[model samples]
Every structure is written in structure tokens, then in C-alpha cells.
Target: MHHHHHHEVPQTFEVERIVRKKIVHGNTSYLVKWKNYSSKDNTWETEDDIRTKYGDLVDDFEKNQKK
Candidate 1:
């Protein structure tokens, strides 16, 4: 027996990592690398969104950036 993982679009995507960051008009946004996507599919998500789902990653990314 073979198990294949064939997911599709329109489904929930998890954050792989924070690629880049930016602040605009007093708001922070993060460049998110989707777990099952490529860098070309990376997107900019708000800080609130990131914190709600991937708070630990946010902290780690910021701590690393500070170094």
C-alpha cells in the first residue's frame, strides 16, 4: 500500500518561517513562508496574525534578528 499526500489550494496553510519583516504606518508585517509552498508563494502577514498562530516563531525570528 502507498500513502500519498496530495493537498490542494483553498485549504489552510501553515507558516513555515518568517522570511522578512517590515513596519508601515506604525504596524508590523511579516513575510511568511508557507509550510507546503515555495519562496515564490511567500506572503506578508500581519503581526497579530503571526502571534495568534505562531507566536514562538515570531519571538525566535525577532531574537535572531537582534543578533
Candidate 2:
């Protein structure tokens, strides 16, 4: 008799959130906000996935921070 082995995979959904924050520094202050999204998986896949998907956009925002 032959036996077969099967592996299990989990399903994931995508979730997104919009965040807004205000910073106060004496005379200088700024407001920052953006939309962020991630995969709602059982495993920790959001970090890499989010970075890969939105790295460029995030990078652009980071550049804006310097201005």
C-alpha cells in the first residue's frame, strides 16, 4: 500500500488603514497621514509583503519628511 502526504496552507485577506498624526515642536509642527495596507494572514507575512508592495510610496513619503 502507498500513502500520500498533504501540506496545509492558510488563506489570507487584505486590510488597510488610514492614519493621521500631528506633531508639535515649539514653533515648528507638521501633520502626517497616509494609507497603509497589509495581508491578514495567520503567519507574519505583513512586513515583507507591505514593504514590497508599498516600498516606493513609503520611500517617497519619507523623502517628503526631510523637506
Candidate 3:
């Protein structure tokens, strides 16, 4: 049996980029691409999920979109 990487080790993941936005009544969601990962791994995250770490990065994406 090939069970090499069954349980992956601890690896801190960083935000590669914010793809797009999904806004609703009182919540905001963004498609996040994980650094060093594939596009298939991209997932949606709430504002609070990344605000603490990637707050400035999110703002930068927002500003860049206003062109």
C-alpha cells in the first residue's frame, strides 16, 4: 500500500491573491488562492477569516479594481 503522505505535516499557508468578491446582506467573501498551491485549491473565505493577516493585501486588491 502506498500511504506516504496520508497525513500532511504542518505547513503555514500564505495568501497568494484574492480572485473575486461575493457580497451579501452583512457578509463579504473572497476567493483566496493559497501560495504554493494549485488553482483547484482556491476557496472562498469570509472577511474575518483573513482580515487579521491579509487586511492590507485585501485593501490593495480593492484599490486595484477601481480602474
Candidate 4:
């Protein structure tokens, strides 16, 4: 048996936006968009372009950890 422990942290601020949206999808093109909460500036930023991935946007939030 395996157990995973999850802890919750008290939020000092409120979240602005966190959602996923479809940009484009077709036989020749596939694209997805990810919008997540940013604690630093407390705002949302979008990443466009078909080549861009969700992980890339997540990296941005991680880089701005300190704010």
C-alpha cells in the first residue's frame, strides 16, 4: 500500500486566474494554453504560439517565486 501526504498552506493573497483553454487543434496543428495563478505580482500572463507548452509557462511562474 502506498500513501501520499498533501499539506495545505495558508494563502496570504487571493488568486486571480487559473484556467486551461484550447488555442488550436487540427490534423496539421495542435496547440493548448495554460493559465495559472501568480503569487508574486498577483496577475495573470498568457503564453501564445503553437510551439509553446504548458511546462514552459509553469517554468515562468517558478522563476518568479520570490516576486
> After superposition on all CA atoms, how large is the RMSD of candidate 2?
11.6
Model 1, range 1-67, lDDT digits (tens) per residue? 7665768743444667787789899999887777747777777779888766667677879779979
- Model 4 lDDT tens row, 1-67: 6765655534222232323323234222222222223333332333432224334444444346427
In terms of lDDT, the poorest run of 10 residues in model 3 is: 3-12
Task: Provide TM-scores for the models.
Answer: 0.63, 0.24, 0.56, 0.20
Top candidate when judged by TM-score against the true structure = 1
Pick by TM-score: 2 or 3, better one? 3
Per-model root-mean-square deviation over C-alphas = 7.2, 11.6, 7.1, 13.5
| Alpha-carbon runs more than 4 Å astray in model 2 | 1-50
- Candidate 2 accuracy as lDDT: 0.34
Ranking by TM-score: 1, 3, 2, 4
In candidate 4, stretches whose alpha carbon ends up further than 4 angstroms from where it belongs are 1-53
Please give the distance, in angstroms, between residue 14's alpha carbon in candidate 3 and its true position after superposition.
1.9
User: In candidate 2, what residue range of length 10 has the lowest lDDT sum?
Assistant: 26-35
lDDT (C-alpha, whole model) for all candidates: 0.75, 0.34, 0.68, 0.35
The residue-by-residue lDDT of candidate 3 on 1-67, one tens digit each, is 8444434433334667776678689788876676738667777778777555566567777668856
Model 1, residue 61: what's the lDDT?
94
* Model with the higher TM-score, candidate 1 or 2: 1
